Design a protein around this ligand. Structure first.
Ligand SMILES: [Zn+2]
Lengths: 72, 326, 76
């Protein structure tokens, strides 16, 4: 399935994911596509910071949901 | 590079509502031509910056830049016309009306912009059958509510122009055909049942249809309609065909439209993302004035898309060009 | 004077107003009938979205004018 990751630095990324994918997996895919190290990535959905051990389905992240990526 | 395609647009801080709209407007060559005529310094920054972006977004030959900076337009908006905050999400439809009205205001500071049409508004009292003066109201878009088996664009249009009855409407006529009552004497103002109906009056060269996906629940909360609304590449409006804009005025397939862009909202009732499906820019030696190729554009990211994908999407704003009369 | 508002279901309701009424006032009356908070309402007349602080008189909105009510669907 497809989700969007808006960054604050002007790119909006598309990701191919499964609801079963963990946040760690998603950060891995963001690294693979953009070269941003997972340890620098903070993901936000509905004002909530996503945690590595959890999945997209855990946060009720749906097809074409939008995540915000903020860097530390 | 973006060889067979168009530049993307930087997202300048939750500005997908602007980028999606720009990509849609860029697929309306009549609007571009109008703006070109129109644009030929702070007060005109909006139209100049909009013109520059649309031109760069409607070029058959790829330009020097893969991704464009819509900063002059955003600045003109935020500072001079629509004082929105820097990082807040907005409605592309609301931006659309800001742009058409701002451009018309630059104008009256001369043909109307090609999104402009007119509705006809007819109403009559059921008690005395006196017909009210006809209202001929401008529109820049058609905001269609979605009825509640799949829903079609045609059902939305049909619902839009269908007649309705409205109760407790003032009728001066029935008020004066009313006997007074000896109390002094009181004459009760007569409120009656009226039939009312909107019809399509003047049709624009560029058509913006707004599908109202955000509504109000019975429980008093906003809800987003996610369901598909079936629409077509070609739209005939022949089926759906004094006071003008409040001012008393004087009054004394033919309407075939071709889809050029579909702006899509992804998300819930409170927030999300906007993307745009759009035709490629017209080619000089095409066999049609329009390109048969489609693109999907999400801010900076541009890719080719199929018409199947376009038609299967969740349309929010639909953009059409009127095809030359028969 | 009476004007019309086309609601979110396409049904058209009546409103009782004065030319001197502000758009905020009008939105309050719409809330009275439809339960929609004024800050969530967008009103459009003759293709122009009405703004708070103006009056109906400012817009040449006459008896039996039709306003269109739409909500604000945000995406960023
Ligand atoms: Zn009557």
């Amino acid at each position: 399935m497809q989700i969007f990751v808006k960054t604050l630095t002007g790119k909006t990324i598309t990701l191919e994911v499964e609801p079963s994918d963990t946040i760690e997996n998603v950060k891995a895919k963001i690294q693979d596509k953009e070269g941003i190290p997972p340890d620098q990535q903070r993901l936000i959905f509905a004002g909530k910071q996503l945690e590595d051990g959890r999945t997209l389905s855990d946060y009720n992240i749906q097809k074409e949901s939008t995540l915000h990526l903020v860097l530390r | 590079s973006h060889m067979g395609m168009v530049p993307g647009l930087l997202n300048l801080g939750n500005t997908a509502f602007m980028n999606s709209l720009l990509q849609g407007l860029a697929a309306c060559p009549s609007f571009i031509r109008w703006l070109e005529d129109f644009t030929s310094e702070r007060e005109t920054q909006l139209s100049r910056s909009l013109m520059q972006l649309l031109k760069a977004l409607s070029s058959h030959v790829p330009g020097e830049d893969d991704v464009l900076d819509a900063g002059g337009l955003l600045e003109a908006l935020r500072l001079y016309r629509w004082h929105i905050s820097s990082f807040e999400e907005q409605d592309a439809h609301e931006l659309f009306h800001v742009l058409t009205s701002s451009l018309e205001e630059e104008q009256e500071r001369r043909t109307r912009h090609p999104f402009h049409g007119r509705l006809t508004s007819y109403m009559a009292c059921k008690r005395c059958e006196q017909q009210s003066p006809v209202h001929y109201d401008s529109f820049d878009s058609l905001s269609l509510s979605i009825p509640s088996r799949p829903v079609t664009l045609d059902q939305c249009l049909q619902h839009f122009i269908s007649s309705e009855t409205i109760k407790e409407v003032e009728c001066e006529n029935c008020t004066k055909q009313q006997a007074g009552e000896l109390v002094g004497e009181v004459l009760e103002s007569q409120r009656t049942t009226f039939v009312k109906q909107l019809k399509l009056g003047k049709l624009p060269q560029c058509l913006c249809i707004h599908l109202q996906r955000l509504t109000w629940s019975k429980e008093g909360s906003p809800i987003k309609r996610q369901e598909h609304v079936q629409f077509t590449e070609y739209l005939s409006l022949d089926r759906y065909k004094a006071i003008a804009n409040g001012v008393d005025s004087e009054h004394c397939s033919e309407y075939l439209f071709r889809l050029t862009a579909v702006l899509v909202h992804h998300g819930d009732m409170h927030s999300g993302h906007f993307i745009t499906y759009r035709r490629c820019p017209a080619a000089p030696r095409g066999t049609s004035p329009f390109s048969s190729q489609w693109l999907w554009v999400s801010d900076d990211s541009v890719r080719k898309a199929s018409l199947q994908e376009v038609l299967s999407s969740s349309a929010y704003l639909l953009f059409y060009e009127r095809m030359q009369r028969p």
